[PDB]
Amino acid sequence: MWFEILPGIAVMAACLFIPGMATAHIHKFTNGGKEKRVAHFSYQWNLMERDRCISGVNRYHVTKGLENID
Amino acid sequence: FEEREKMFEFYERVSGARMHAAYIRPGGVHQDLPLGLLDDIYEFSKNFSFRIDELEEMLTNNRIWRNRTVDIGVVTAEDALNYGFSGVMLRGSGIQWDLRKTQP
Amino acid sequence: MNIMLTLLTNVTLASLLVLIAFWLPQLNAYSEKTSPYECGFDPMGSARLPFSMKFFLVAITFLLFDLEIALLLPLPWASQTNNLKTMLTMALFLLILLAASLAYEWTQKGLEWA
Amino acid sequence: GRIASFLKNAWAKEPVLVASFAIGGLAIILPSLSPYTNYAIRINRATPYNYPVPLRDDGNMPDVPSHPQDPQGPSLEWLKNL
Amino acid sequence: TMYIAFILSTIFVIGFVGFSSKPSPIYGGLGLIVSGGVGCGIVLNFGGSFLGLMVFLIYLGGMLVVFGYTTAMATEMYPEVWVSNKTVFGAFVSGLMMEFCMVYYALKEEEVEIIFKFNGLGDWVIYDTGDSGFFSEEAMGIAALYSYGTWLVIVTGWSLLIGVVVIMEITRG
Amino acid sequence: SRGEYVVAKLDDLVNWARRSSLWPMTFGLACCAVEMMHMAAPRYDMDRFGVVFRASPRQSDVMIVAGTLTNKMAPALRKVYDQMPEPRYVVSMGSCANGGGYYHYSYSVVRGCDRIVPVDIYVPGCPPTAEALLYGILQLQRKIKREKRLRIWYRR
Amino acid sequence: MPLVYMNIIMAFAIALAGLLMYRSHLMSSLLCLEGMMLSLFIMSTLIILNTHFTLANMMPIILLVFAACEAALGLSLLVMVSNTYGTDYVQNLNLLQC
Amino acid sequence: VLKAAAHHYGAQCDKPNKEFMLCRWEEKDPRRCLEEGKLVNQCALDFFRQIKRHCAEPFTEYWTCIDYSGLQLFRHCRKQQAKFDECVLDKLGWVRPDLG
Amino acid sequence: MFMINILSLIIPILLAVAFLTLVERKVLGYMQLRKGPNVVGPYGLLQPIADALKLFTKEPLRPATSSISMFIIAPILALSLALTMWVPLPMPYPLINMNLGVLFMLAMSSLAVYSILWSGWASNSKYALIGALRAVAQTISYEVTLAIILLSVLLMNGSYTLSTLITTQEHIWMIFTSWPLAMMWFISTLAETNRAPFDLTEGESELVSGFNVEYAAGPFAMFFMAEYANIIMMNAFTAILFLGASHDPHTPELYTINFVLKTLALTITFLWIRASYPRFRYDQLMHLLWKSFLPLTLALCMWHISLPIMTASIPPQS
Amino acid sequence: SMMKWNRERRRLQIEDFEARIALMPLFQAEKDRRVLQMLRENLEEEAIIMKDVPDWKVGESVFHTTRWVTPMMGELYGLRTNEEILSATYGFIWYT
Amino acid sequence: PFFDVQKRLGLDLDRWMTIQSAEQPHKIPGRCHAFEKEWIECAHGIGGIRAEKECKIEFDDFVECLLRQKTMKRLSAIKRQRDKLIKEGKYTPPPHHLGKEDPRP
Amino acid sequence: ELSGEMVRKCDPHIGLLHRGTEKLIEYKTYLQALPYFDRLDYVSMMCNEQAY
C-alpha cells in the first residue's frame, strides 16, 4: 500500500546523504583529521599562511605545539 | 473515475457493454434486470455521496479554483435563451427551466 | 579557482550529455518531422512576430524594484554600526519610499494589465 | 465611529493590507519607545573590530588604564548580565 | 593563471563587441549577460565579492525585461545574428580585430601608450600587502551608506520614486 | 562469439528501456478515448507499467488512435505522427480506427488509420474494454521485446 | 596603468561607438547604454577597491541605481514609439527635422 | 596554539607588546621599531616557557580541541579551557582577563 | 581530492533526481487511489533508469525554424546551473565556502531563467514563445519578494554566509521567528521552480508542453533533470534557512541525515501540493505576488530591521 | 530565544576579537620583519641583476619623500616564484 | 555658480566622501592616506594657482602612490634585465627566490 | 486571435469528428439506428437511447 513508496524515498535519501558525508570525510582527510579551516576574513587567511610556514612542510593542518619552542 | 468504473459495470451487467449498451430500445428496454443488480446499485449509491463531498472539499472552497471560475464566461439570461443554450447553461444564469419538471 | 573548477566540470558534464544525446541514437530526419508544432495543423503566422506585453509597466517598475532590492542588500552589515538611530531611520525611509512607489503604482492602476 | 467602520471593512475586504500597515507601523514606532535600543548601540561600540592603539603616558592621565586588567577603564559587566 | 583578470577583461571586451555590433536584441542580451558575468568575475578577483555579485544579479534581472520587450517591440520576422548581416558581421570582426591588435601591442610591447600609458605587467602587481583583519572592507564601506551616506540614500530614494512616477506618466498616452 | 553476445545484451537493454517506459501522446478522437481514460483510471493504472501520457508529440513514443479518423482529421493525424521522434509506434483502438467501424460506408470517414499511418497493434472493440486496450499495449511491449535492431546491425 | 584598466576603457569606448552608430532598432541603443553603464561600474569598482577608498565603495551601487533608472526611462520611451508607430525602428523618429 | 593561550598572553605580555604597538603607531616606520619587535618575541617565548614547565599537558589538551574546529571556536572547548585556567591559576598564578 | 568531491556532489544529486521522478509518480498515484510505477523493477525502482535509457536512445529532433545555437545552449545552462547551485549548500560543511553564498544562489537562479527564455525563444514555436513570456512574467512576480524575504530572514543571521545559518538555529528553528516569511518564501520557491499551482511555463493542460514543447530525447531529459534538481536544491535551501538541524562537529552524519530528511519532507510536500490544487492563471500569480506578498514582505522587512535594534539582539557580523 | 542567543553570540564575538587583539602585536612584528627581509633580498638580487645596466642606481627610491611607503605586491614578490606570487596575491580570494 | 550652501549652513552633505583621508568607518585607512594628507596640508589655503606649482612634489608622490606607474616601470626593467641575464646564463636566482627556503613567519 | 494572451477572437472549427450519422441512419432500420445514438454523446449513452 502506501509503504510501497518507502523504497524509492530511501534510495533518494541515500543519494542525498552521500554528498554531505563525502564532503565532510574529504575535508577531514585533506586537513589532518580536523575540520577544514574557514578563512572568511583576511585575518583567518593570515593565520592559515603563518601556520603553513610554522609547519615547515607547507601544510597548515600539521600544528606545532610547545614542543617546537626551544 | 473509480466510481465511474463501478457504474460502468452496471451498464455491463445489464446489457453486456461498458459504454454502448444499446439497452434502451423503442418499446422499453432489451432485457430485464439481472438478479442482485438493484442491491449492488444501492451499495454504490450509498457511499457515492462521500465521493461528491470529497470532490467539493478539493474544489468548492479552494480559492485557486474560485479564481479560475468565478466571473468567467458570464452568460446573461436573455443571451442564453437567444443563443439556444439549454440545461446547466440556462439554470446557471438563474433561468428556472428543467425538461424533467416542465415536460416530464 | 575551485569555483572555476566546479563550473567547468558542470558545463563539461552538461555538454557531454548533449553530445551523447545527439550522437548515440539512430537519426532519421525529414522535413515533416522537423516542422514547427501547432497541435497537428500548420501554423498561420511566424512565431517571431510581435507578442504584446500586457504587463509592460509591471516589468519597467520591476526594474526599479530590483534596484531597491540591490540598495537594501547591505542592511545586515549596516546594523553593525554605532549610529543605529540614523541607520534605522534611513533603512525605514528606503522601505517607506518603496512602499509609497508600490502604492502609487497600485492606486493609479499600474499593476493592472492590458 | 467612522474609524471602526473603516477598519472592520478594511479587514473584511483586504485583510492583507491591514496586517502590513499594522506591522509596518509598529516597526517605526516601537524602536523609539524602547529601552533596549541604547543597549543595541552600546553593544556595537563594545565590539573591538580594530586594535586599541595605546597612547603615550605623560603622567597626567588618571583614568586612562595603563595596565593589563587593573580596575581603570570601561567595563563590559553590563553586557555579561544582559 | 597569473593572468586570469586579463583573460576575463578580454572576454568583457569580446562581449561588448558582441552587443555593440547590434545583432538581434535577443543576441545582444546574451552578449551583455556574458559581459556582466565576466565583469563580476573580475570584481571578485579584485576582492569585490558583493559588488561583483551585485552587478551580476541586477543586470541578470534587467536583461530579462529587455528580452521580454525584444519579443514584443524589437521582434523582426527574421531576427539577425552576428553572421546574418555583413554590416553586423563587419562590426563584430572590426571590434575583435581592434581588441586583438591592442592586446598584442600591449603584451609584446610592455609599455603601450594609445591614449593613456598602460603597463604590460600582470595586474597582480598593483595589489596591496595590507591586512584588513576581521573585515570585508568593501562590505563595510557599502554598509556605510545608511550611516554616512544619509544624503545619498535620500536622493536615490527620491529618484527611484520619481522614476516610478515618470514611468507611469510616460506610459499613459 | 563475444561480439554477438554483447550486441544481444545491448539490444535487450535498449528494448527493455523502450518497452517499459512507453509514453503515449494525449490523442483521443471519439468514444474510444473515454475508455482510454479508464485505462489511466486507478483500477487499471497505465502509469503503473510506466505508460505515462505525455502531451507534446515530440515527447511521446506511441500514438494511440482512439476514435473515428475523419477525412478532415486525417492530415492532422499524419502530421502529428510525423512529428513524433523515432522510434514511434501506432496502436489502433476501436473498430472505428481499425477499418471504419460503424461508419465504414461514410463519405467523411477514413476506412481505418492504417491508410494514414502504419499500425503496430490493432485493438478490437466498440469500444474495446480498458483491459483490451491494456492487453494491446502490453502486447506492444512484448513486440518491442522481440526487436533485434542492434542484433541485425551486427549481421548487416 | 594595468592592462585591465585598458581593457575596460576600450570596452566603454566600443559601447559608446555602438550607441553613437545606430542601425535599425532603438532597443540596441539602450543595450549600448547599459553596456557603457556596466563598463563604468567595473572601472569605478576596480579603482575604489585598488585604492582602498572604503567610504567610496557605495559609489558603484548608486551608479548602478541611476543606470537602471535611465534604462527604465529608455524602455518606457521605446514602448511609446512602438505604440505610436508599430515598430521601434529609429527611422520612424523623423517628424522633427533640422 | 596561539589562540588557546591568547587571553593569558595578552595579560602577561602586555607591557612589551603595548610598547611595540606605540612605537609602530608613532614612528610609522617598521625599521624604527625592530628592537621593540625583538622584545615582543623574547617575552612571548618566555610566556610559553612557563606554560611548558607548569601546565604542559592541560594546555596541550586545550589547543588540540580548539585546533579541530574550522572556526577555532572557544565555545566548543570550555571544558578543556577550565582545566587549563585552573592549573595556570595554581601553578603560575595567572588570572584570565574578563570580557572587554 | 577536490575533483572527487565535485563528483560526489554531482552524481548523487543526479541519482536523487532520477529517483525523485519515481517518488513523485508513486506519491501522486497513491494520493489518486493509484499505484506508481510498480512493474519495472521491484516496487518500480528501475523505472528512472528505463526512462533515462529511452530518452537518450530516442532520436532528438532539431526544428527547422529553430536557432540551433541557443536551442542547444539553453539545456546546458539549465543543467549546469542546477548542478552549480548545490556547490555552496552547507551540509553540514559546504563544498565551496563563500561569504556571500546566498547572493550567489540568487544570481545563479536569475541566470537559470534564461534557459527557459532561450529554449522558448529559440524553439521558434508559438507555444514555446508563450511559455518563455510566461517564464518572464513569473520571474517578474517572485524575484523581488524572494529577495526581500531572504534578506529579512537573514537579518537575524548577521551575514549572507550559508554556514552561519546552522549556528543561528542552534537552539531554535528560525521558522518559529519568521513563519509568515516562511510561508511566503515557500510559495515563492514554488513559483520560482515553475512548480505546483505555478506550472505556467510548461502548462501541460494549457500549453501542451510549454517552452520545452519542441524538445525531445536528451535535451528534454536535461531540462527535466534541471527542473527536479532545482526543486531539491530549493527545498534544501528552505530546510537550512528555517528548519535548522543540530550539528555535532565530531559526528557530521547526524546533521547530514537530519538535513536530508527535512529536504525529503519538503519535496514530498511539493508533490503533495502538486496533486492537491488547480493551476493559477499567471495574471493571478503576478497579482498575488505583487499585491498580497510584496506589501507584507516590505512590512516584515521593516519589522525584522527594527526588531534586533529594539531588542538589542543584533547578530554578530563574523 | 533568538534575542538571548544573539546576545550570547555577540559576547562570544567580543571574546574572539579580544583574543585577536592579544595576538596582534606579535603578528605585526613578524609581518614587518618578513617584509623588511623580503625587501632586502630583492635589493640584494637586484644589485647583481642590474649591475651591468648603465645609470641604474640600486635601491633608488621612486618617491621624493624620505618616509616609509608600504611596498606593493610586485615590490615584494616581484622576482619570487610564480606559485608564491599566486599564493600571496589570490590566496584569500580564491580560498573557499 | 557653486552656491556653497554646505559651508554656509554648516551641513555636511558630500564633503565626507570627497577624499580618502577623511573619516572612514572603523578607521580603515586609505591606501595613500599619508600622501594625500601631505598634499592637502601643503596646499591648504594657498590657492589653486600656487598649489599646482609649489606643492607639486607632494602631488607627484600622491600620484605615484595611486598609480605606481614609475614603480611598475622600474619593476618591469628589473624583470626584463633578469630575463635577459637568465637567457645568457649570467645570473642564477637564489634559493629563497626559487622556492627552496622556508619564508619567515 | 490572441493579443498577447487576451482572446480577441475565438473561432471554433468543428467537423473533425463528423461521421455522417444522420445520413447513415437513413439507410438502416429503426432498430439498426439505435446504436448510432450511443456514439453521439459517448459520455452519456443511455440518455441518448431514451431520447431516440
Ligand code: SF4
Ligand atoms: S469503435 Fe465504437 S466506441 Fe470506438 S470510436 Fe468508433 S464508434 Fe466510438
